[PDB]
Amino acid sequence: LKETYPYYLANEAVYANAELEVTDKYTGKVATRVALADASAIDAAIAAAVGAQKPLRALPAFRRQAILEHCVARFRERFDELAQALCIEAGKPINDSKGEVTRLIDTFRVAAEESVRIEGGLVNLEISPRAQGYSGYYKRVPIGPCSFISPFNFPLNLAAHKVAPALAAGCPFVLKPASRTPIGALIIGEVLAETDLPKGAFSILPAHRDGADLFTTDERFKLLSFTGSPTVGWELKKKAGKKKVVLELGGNAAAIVDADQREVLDYVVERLAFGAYYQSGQSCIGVQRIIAHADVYDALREKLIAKTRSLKMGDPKDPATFVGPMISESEARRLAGWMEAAVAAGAKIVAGGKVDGAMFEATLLEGVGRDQDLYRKEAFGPVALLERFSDFDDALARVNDSDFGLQAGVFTDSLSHAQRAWDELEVGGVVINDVPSFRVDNMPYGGVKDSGLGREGIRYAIEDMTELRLMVVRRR
Amino acid sequence: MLKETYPYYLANEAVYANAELEVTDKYTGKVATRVALADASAIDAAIAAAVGAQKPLRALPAFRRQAILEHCVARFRERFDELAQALCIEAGKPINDSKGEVTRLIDTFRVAAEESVRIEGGLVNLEISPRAQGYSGYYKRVPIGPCSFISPFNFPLNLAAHKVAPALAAGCPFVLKPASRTPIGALIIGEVLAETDLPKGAFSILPAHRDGADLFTTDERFKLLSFTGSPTVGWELKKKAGKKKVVLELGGNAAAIVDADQREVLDYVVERLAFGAYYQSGQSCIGVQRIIAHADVYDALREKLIAKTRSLKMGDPKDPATFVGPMISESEARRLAGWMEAAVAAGAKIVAGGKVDGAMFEATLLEGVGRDQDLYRKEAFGPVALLERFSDFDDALARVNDSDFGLQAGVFTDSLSHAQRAWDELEVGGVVINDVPSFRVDNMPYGGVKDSGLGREGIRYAIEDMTELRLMVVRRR
Amino acid sequence: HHHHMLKETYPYYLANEAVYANAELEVTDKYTGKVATRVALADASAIDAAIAAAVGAQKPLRALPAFRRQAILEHCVARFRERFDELAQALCIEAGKPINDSKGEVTRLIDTFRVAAEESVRIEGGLVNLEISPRAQGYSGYYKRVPIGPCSFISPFNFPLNLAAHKVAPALAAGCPFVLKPASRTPIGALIIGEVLAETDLPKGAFSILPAHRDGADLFTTDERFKLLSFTGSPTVGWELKKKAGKKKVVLELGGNAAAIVDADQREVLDYVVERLAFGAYYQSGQSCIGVQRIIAHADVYDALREKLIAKTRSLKMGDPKDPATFVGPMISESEARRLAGWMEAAVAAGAKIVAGGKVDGAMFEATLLEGVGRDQDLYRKEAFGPVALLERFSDFDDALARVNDSDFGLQAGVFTDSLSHAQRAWDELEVGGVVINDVPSFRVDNMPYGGVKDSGLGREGIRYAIEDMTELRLMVVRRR
Amino acid sequence: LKETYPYYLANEAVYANAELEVTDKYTGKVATRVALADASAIDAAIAAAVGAQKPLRALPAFRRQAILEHCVARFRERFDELAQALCIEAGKPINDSKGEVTRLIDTFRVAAEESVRIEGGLVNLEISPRAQGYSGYYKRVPIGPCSFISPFNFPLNLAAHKVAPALAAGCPFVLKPASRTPIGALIIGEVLAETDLPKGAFSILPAHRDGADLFTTDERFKLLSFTGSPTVGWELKKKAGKKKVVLELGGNAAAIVDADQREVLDYVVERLAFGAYYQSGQSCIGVQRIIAHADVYDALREKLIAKTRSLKMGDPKDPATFVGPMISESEARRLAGWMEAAVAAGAKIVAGGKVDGAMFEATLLEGVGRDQDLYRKEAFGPVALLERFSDFDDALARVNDSDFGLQAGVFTDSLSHAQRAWDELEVGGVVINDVPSFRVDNMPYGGVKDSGLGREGIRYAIEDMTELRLMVVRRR
Numbered sequence A, D: 001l002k003e004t005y006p007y008y009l010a011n012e013a014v015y016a017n018a019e020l021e022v023t024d025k026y027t028g029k030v031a032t033r034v035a036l037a038d039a040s041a042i043d044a045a046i047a048a049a050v051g052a053q054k055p056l057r058a059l060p061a062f063r064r065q066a067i068l069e070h071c072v073a074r075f076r077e078r079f080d081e082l083a084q085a086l087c088i089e090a091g092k093p094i095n096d097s098k099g100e101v102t103r104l105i106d107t108f109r110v111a112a113e114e115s116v117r118i119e120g121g122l123v124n125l126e127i128s129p130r131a132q133g134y135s136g137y138y139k140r141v142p143i144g145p146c147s148f149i150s151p152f153n154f155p156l157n158l159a160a161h162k163v164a165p166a167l168a169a170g171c172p173f174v175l176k177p178a179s180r181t182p183i184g185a186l187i188i189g190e191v192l193a194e195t196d197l198p199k200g201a202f203s204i205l206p207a208h209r210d211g212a213d214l215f216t217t218d219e220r221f222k223l224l225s226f227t228g229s230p231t232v233g234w235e236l237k238k239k240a241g242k243k244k245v246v247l248e249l250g251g252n253a254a255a256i257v258d259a260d261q262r263e264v265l266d267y268v269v270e271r272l273a274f275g276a277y278y279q280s281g282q283s284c285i286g287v288q289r290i291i292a293h294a295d296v297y298d299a300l301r302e303k304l305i306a307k308t309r310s311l312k313m314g315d316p317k318d319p320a321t322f323v324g325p326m327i328s329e330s331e332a333r334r335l336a337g338w339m340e341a342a343v344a345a346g347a348k349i350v351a352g353g354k355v356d357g358a359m360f361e362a363t364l365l366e367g368v369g370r371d372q373d374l375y376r377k378e379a380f381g382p383v384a385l386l387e388r389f390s391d392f393d394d395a396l397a398r399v400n401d402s403d404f405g406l407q408a409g410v411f412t413d414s415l416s417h418a419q420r421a422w423d424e425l426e427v428g429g430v431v432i433n434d435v436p437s438f439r440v441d442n443m444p445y446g447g448v449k450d451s452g453l454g455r456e457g458i459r460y461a462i463e464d465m466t467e468l469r470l471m472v473v474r475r476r
Numbered sequence B: 001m002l003k004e005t006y007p008y009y010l011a012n013e014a015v016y017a018n019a020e021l022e023v024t025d026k027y028t029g030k031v032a033t034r035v036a037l038a039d040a041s042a043i044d045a046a047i048a049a050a051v052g053a054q055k056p057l058r059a060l061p062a063f064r065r066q067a068i069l070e071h072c073v074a075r076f077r078e079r080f081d082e083l084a085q086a087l088c089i090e091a092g093k094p095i096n097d098s099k100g101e102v103t104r105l106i107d108t109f110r111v112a113a114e115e116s117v118r119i120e121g122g123l124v125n126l127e128i129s130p131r132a133q134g135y136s137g138y139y140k141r142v143p144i145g146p147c148s149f150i151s152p153f154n155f156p157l158n159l160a161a162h163k164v165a166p167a168l169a170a171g172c173p174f175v176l177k178p179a180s181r182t183p184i185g186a187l188i189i190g191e192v193l194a195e196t197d198l199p200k201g202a203f204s205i206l207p208a209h210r211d212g213a214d215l216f217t218t219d220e221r222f223k224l225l226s227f228t229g230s231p232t233v234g235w236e237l238k239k240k241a242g243k244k245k246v247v248l249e250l251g252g253n254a255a256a257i258v259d260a261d262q263r264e265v266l267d268y269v270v271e272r273l274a275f276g277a278y279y280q281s282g283q284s285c286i287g288v289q290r291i292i293a294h295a296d297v298y299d300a301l302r303e304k305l306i307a308k309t310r311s312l313k314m315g316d317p318k319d320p321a322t323f324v325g326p327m328i329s330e331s332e333a334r335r336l337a338g339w340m341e342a343a344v345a346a347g348a349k350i351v352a353g354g355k356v357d358g359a360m361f362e363a364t365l366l367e368g369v370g371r372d373q374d375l376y377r378k379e380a381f382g383p384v385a386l387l388e389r390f391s392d393f394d395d396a397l398a399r400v401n402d403s404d405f406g407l408q409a410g411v412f413t414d415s416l417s418h419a420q421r422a423w424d425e426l427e428v429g430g431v432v433i434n435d436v437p438s439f440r441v442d443n444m445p446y447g448g449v450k451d452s453g454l455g456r457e458g459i460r461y462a463i464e465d466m467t468e469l470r471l472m473v474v475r476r477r
Numbered sequence C: 001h002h003h004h005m006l007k008e009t010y011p012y013y014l015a016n017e018a019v020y021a022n023a024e025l026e027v028t029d030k031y032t033g034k035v036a037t038r039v040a041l042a043d044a045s046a047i048d049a050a051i052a053a054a055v056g057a058q059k060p061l062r063a064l065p066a067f068r069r070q071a072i073l074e075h076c077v078a079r080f081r082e083r084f085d086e087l088a089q090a091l092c093i094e095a096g097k098p099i100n101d102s103k104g105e106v107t108r109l110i111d112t113f114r115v116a117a118e119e120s121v122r123i124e125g126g127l128v129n130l131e132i133s134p135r136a137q138g139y140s141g142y143y144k145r146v147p148i149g150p151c152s153f154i155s156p157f158n159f160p161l162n163l164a165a166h167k168v169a170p171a172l173a174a175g176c177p178f179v180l181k182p183a184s185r186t187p188i189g190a191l192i193i194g195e196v197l198a199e200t201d202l203p204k205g206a207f208s209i210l211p212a213h214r215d216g217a218d219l220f221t222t223d224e225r226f227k228l229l230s231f232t233g234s235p236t237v238g239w240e241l242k243k244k245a246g247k248k249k250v251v252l253e254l255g256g257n258a259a260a261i262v263d264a265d266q267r268e269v270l271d272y273v274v275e276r277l278a279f280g281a282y283y284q285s286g287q288s289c290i291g292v293q294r295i296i297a298h299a300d301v302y303d304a305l306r307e308k309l310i311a312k313t314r315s316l317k318m319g320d321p322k323d324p325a326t327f328v329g330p331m332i333s334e335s336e337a338r339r340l341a342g343w344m345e346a347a348v349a350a351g352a353k354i355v356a357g358g359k360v361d362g363a364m365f366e367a368t369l370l371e372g373v374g375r376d377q378d379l380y381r382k383e384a385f386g387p388v389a390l391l392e393r394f395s396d397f398d399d400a401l402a403r404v405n406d407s408d409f410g411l412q413a414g415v416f417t418d419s420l421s422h423a424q425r426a427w428d429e430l431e432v433g434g435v436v437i438n439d440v441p442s443f444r445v446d447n448m449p450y451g452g453v454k455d456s457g458l459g460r461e462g463i464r465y466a467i468e469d470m471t472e473l474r475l476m477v478v479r480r481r
Ligand SMILES: *[C@@H]1C=CN([C@@H]2O[C@H](COP(=O)(O)OP(=O)(O)OC[C@H]3O[C@@H](n4cnc5c(N)ncnc54)[C@H](OP(=O)(O)O)[C@@H]3O)[C@@H](O)[C@H]2O)C=C1C(N)=O
Pocket: A149, A150, A151, A152, A153, A154, A158, A176, A177, A178, A179, A180, A207, A208, A209, A210, A212, A213, A215, A216, A227, A228, A229, A230, A232, A233, A248, A249, A250, A251, A283, A284, A285, A378, A380, A446, A452
């Protein structure tokens, strides 16, 4: 890592200060220092984004594509640097960190392809005699300056899912990364600064939530796009004013294991362990609830206990580590408190369960009451809950027994069960024969209920960052 | 003649709960009918019924929803004169234009009947990288949930239709609050819907005054608020909406450019300008408020427009000869008259019309209105238009955009390049070429940017906001 | 409501108007053999005149706005509903089609025109971003669909209303003038449609409907003024017509020997499966281009399915198609029944066994079920087009898929299964136009893409897809500097 | 150039013989020798294509994309080699040759992007009570083995418009390039041979038209896609048998100059000279007929005579050459015979007109009667005809006064004239404010009337190389 990082104000690196300390989430020592933006800098960034609307809009589509393709090439060259920085600032196991840099590249690559493909349309207006001679044409224009707020757990790829569409769509933006994990955003900033984007087209400004009011309230932003916790996101919607609001939040995702799965339980168990425990459960679609049919429950339980106990916890820089530290000791203590309450109420820890500082073991529980915080709130840690069902409709009801609705998974070979799950699960996406934790970066992605408002995935984010501009032409 | 009293509709059924809401004839000023006024207990009951109707409504196949919409079309056609006359009374809308809106009401439900059997689904290729080998993606649209609908006084039928008909096509239960000044049209829509086999709770139509309507914005069981009305109200309701999606269809001060090449078609242009500026006495969210005309045609356009404006017949909207009926109230005529007087005091000149008697506001044309005047920058929503002159097309575009609003604009031109530039640079929802900004057909994407709205109506586009994508990812190994 | 009688003579339609040119074409009641009516037979001079009028109608027809074409289509819908019984009874007589299934086809006629009425106001155009490289900076693309030109339509005897409708109704939606030649054995329905179409304000020359025997129909294939030949009929004829079509686009809707797979997991729903198999195999005496000809049933359910299917097949009433109790009416002619009976006799001679039905009397062919038909037999590999189905047994699902594909044809196949992976494998591996899951391949709804691959067709019908073939893209590139 | 080139049989270089001599079209000397495929080799290629169907269909989309991206990267590496080979075997001026190599890269680039977004669909089938419970899904599958025939004038890019879609769609193909210009196609074959396409996925086989019968008649091909002269194309359609036929032919394209174009006449004349005389008019959308309004006719005529005379004719290896040799002396004699006939009937040569062997000057004529061969047949040489109009409907009627209908151009600033041109010109494509000679490689491209049947451009070609495969699912 560099000794200091700047922030990016109107496309240019500014070593304004070194007030924001970023710690190695495993050793707790300060790893680097970056410049912290104050309100005057955020205001300057917004002013410059307003000024860049017209130059940015004049860029032809192939120039936007070229800019995105430059990012792709440089992320490829700097692949291991990006992964190592992610490993340090997020505590993310090095193999998962490489997974994320691969996705970062995927996301920018899809955006490069979509930048020359933005949907326009023709509409037939001659639907009645009054409208004889009229024809309709629409194209998508930038919504205007965008305010982007990203979280700690995928500090490259979840920032990418706003930055890359904005570049494809021609919106200037100001991005506030997570203060705990700002480095990846600032490496994206350095790469973007090398392109011929108009000055003001982007700023990337670290700022604590307590100094971030302008990202929500400033009327010069036309879009607020927030990825993070449900409690924060719904509060920001209340204060956004006139701008459009897109929310990517979290949930307590469930995976159903159907009665017909005996012969493939080793496959199911492997995916369940990945979904529940990769990057230590700190995924908005991490597996938290496992709803297993009575016919397979016993063999699944035995296999899942074994697999869970086998996952190495420790130094995320070690390729053998599967379970790194949680983002902070305080977050481990929150989850450990929910776990202890669940246990005192009758639940049993059947694998794992030890917590030391931010080091939370991969843990499996049985008998968690559905009214427990551990069941109903977002665990965001390496805990999974196993329950048993015999009626498939009851399994669906259990998945839906939640404030949230991001993604769900169903392991089944029953056509009608897959159909019924698609129809009845009140989630953004249903995954068949994999865990809810699966995402590919072109697919529409987001939540309903308390889990979000809108869809990301390149094409869908561009939709929200643009406005239809209709032309009606009358011929006489 | 109207019925002596109208019910409201609670969970698909007529309830003559009371007769508290008096509806006046906007021309005679006398009470024309009385209708049932919903209290908060009735609105709460309607919301609970809508929640309960979600699953039965979702269970209806598309062809059943189409049959429900087609029944509405047939009954609206059947009751065409009844609807137009009620509209004429409760809105003071000239009878020919009332008949025009009933025709649009039919069109809107007809488009929705067609769209109900072709709601968009999709396939997604997910095999974009080795990690995703063997995955395929399918998505369909599901109802967003119970919808809260608020409609205004000026197009009570068609602007309610642009929410109700999409909701029927999409399978969303809804609760509609019509404007208290003009609730009869919506209650006739309710009577027609009550004839269909929609599940109970699929719809409620509840008159309520704004000060009793808090739940339409704040109740957490609604998943969408779709509001059509004044910008001042709409942006305030967005602040209080909570978690729900918000769609806003508001107003503006729409402009029309007349280009330098228009000499040979000026009679056509003037006719459309007068229609746009003075149709239903300017009470249109895309009424022509500002006319920006090139110096080359300005003198001939001015003479023709003054003559046309002075020819428009004002009076009893029940008279088919009437083009300018009453404004919705004397207080609204007084509002606009005050801006007009302030503009004249600052140097503007009335060149046609200008006389106001109660709610009877003449079709009025001004020159010399300063760009900083309330008459220029605020939504007139009355039979007043402002004429100004330009010579540089970019100046004309800048003048169109010199506004808080951005709903629609119009450009009369035969220059390909000027049309291209207008489409590119006018910050509006829609640009109309060779007709006024006041044109709308009910299938087109329709809405505003800047302070004029958030989102699009028109059947397909409304369905899109009333539904959520539900993705299915399937892994084969 | 009432028993109708056919008119004594029917005209043909030349440039939208009835011409009682002659009464040379006798149309028989296919059950009684008796001549039912006579219609005007068009000669080559009349065909040429219709083609010339179609050319002349292109510009007027192009000038109709979309809502006018919708109103024309809606008029047909309204009148087909008014004349529902007239159409069903005429269909019953001229095609020998059981009256309940004739009513079913008139319902499809209505649905097909209704879908076309809806599609007529939403014909797709598009925008194209052309700024993909520095050279193309400032260019933008717009495209709309325009009529392909005059269309030649040829339709068969078995679904004479609805298969004509799948060409006529898209042509009206797309704005193509057309000349329709119906099957000489079943021209009445097409001419009733012509009468209804004559009532509309279509420009003169927008349509002609001309009965003509195949030996006098050469211009329908070869005339250079037609820009599209769309043929629905036998594979042998269709592929030959393509060879003689010349420059025009060619669309073919042909036949096949459709198969239905019954998977191992279907025991609890066998009564439903048997009902659909019997419907698919024997509806209109198997004279359907997607009739079930081959049933491929898993060993786990085979014995139970076989007993239920034999009983269901035996229960089917054969007789006068005017009798509403009749499900199996006459085949279209005695010679066609003799063709199929000979293939059946050859299959039995090589070891097959008739396990239900099998009696043939003139054109009255019993609903018949066979076991043990060899895969090399004509009865297996050629289009039966009669009330015969063949039952075979499998255990390996890949072997079942290979058996479905073991064919010159590829129109539709059906699979009864609750296995997600089997449905996916079937979708992926069956070389057919359409795979039906948990119903027979005989299912069709008139908006869906429909057609064959291999020897079963070229192109797709279903309203939206037919419109696409009857139109050309017209691109506009606009350069701004 | 290499001394000898192989052909490609089932993805492999085969030095079967050196029988096909390829000449330098300017010097006339033999430049190289290539292997000539006989009927046995064509048969083996077709058999190998049938065998490759299932392995090729098994490739996931991202693998097809990587194969196409490999081609793009290698064409960039071999850019000068491709351009010089084109300049020799086609006699194409070197700057025009580098232009075509750039297009070759564009075409493959677009195909790589489209390979991962081939359209499928959902259809709502519940349109009547009979169809309650049914749902529709469709995807596109390869049509099968494709027969490709390409012409001499754009040897690289017009072959690319068949090859690249086939790779994106998963169809095996056998390509027969033009015998006069096969080197480009064989360099493409060498690059394709480097990839992990299954053996049999592609063959590229030089063969003279007289030995090419199997490319039209073999029933194992499911598609014939031909680009070349109208006379050959319509003949091949008649012999194609059951296979689908796609035809990209030619025409006598027209450009209208409207009455309002005085202020931009230098631009108009520049584009006219480009469209009429680039690669010596040997383009299927070369400008052959110029229809100019009386109001600007005299000023355009003067500027166009001066422009045409300024164009340097000579050695195509010299970058200063704009007008290289025509493909053969006999093709020059053909065009010069039509020119002499039109002059004998009263036309006047007003610029150029000199022909020496295959060196045909950029030439402009007036007064060519509309019944002349020079007017109605495809000139395919550096000759353009100027005529005059006053009524816009007359100008439209003149454009349509042809057997052909590929593209037309209209220089106008009249909105209504542009709308009318779009509506009434019976062509595949109308170009507004550029010549009909414009093409970008993603746009739908093709002719109506005698000019073609079907559309190329990557997305549109893929549509013709695939079949819809519908799945109807009944739930009860
Ligand atoms: C996919 C992956 C994860 N998630 C959801 O993310 C959170 C876990 O992330 P976390 O960073 O801990 O969430 P957060 O809400 O606390 O902070 C996110 C960003 O918002 C900033 N922020 C907080 N509060 C404010 C206020 N008042 N104003 C402005 N900005 C604010 C944070 O600032 P810092 O102080 O941390 O710098 C930070 O930038 C889980 O809930 C998980 O579900 C969602 C995913 C998805 N759906 O795509």
